[PDB]
Write a protein that binds this DNA or RNA. Structure first.
Length: 99
RNA sequence: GAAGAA
């Protein structure tokens, strides 16, 4: 079947950017930042939204200022509970920032 | 009556 480096998403690798999945529709970027900034410094946080209704799609991303604090948070928050939903967490394979 | 790369 189909397969490619950094296109596959069930086999991530370390990155300052983390993805967060399973979220409740009432979660804000501020709740994610208060829950993840206890593991280290965070420059930004962004929830992913529907284009026609502006509701959350159930996933988001968290941008640390260091890969080793992202390696901490990725192991800390994977399988935790937030607003009555379990969340899962992994390193970003791709991201909106670029340099 | 998916909880996954924007």
């Amino acid at each position: 079947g189909s397969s490619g480096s950094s296109g596959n998403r069930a086999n991530p690798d370390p990155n300052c950017c983390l993805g967060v999945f399973g979220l409740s529709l009432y979660t804000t970027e501020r709740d994610l930042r208060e829950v993840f900034s206890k593991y280290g410094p965070i420059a930004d946080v962004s929830i992913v939204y529907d284009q026609q209704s502006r509701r959350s799609r159930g996933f988001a991303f968290v941008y640390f200022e260091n890969v080793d604090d992202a390696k901490e948070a990725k192991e800390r928050a994977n399988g935790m509970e937030l607003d009555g939903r379990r969340i899962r967490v992994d390193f970003s394979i791709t991201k909106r920032p670029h340099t």
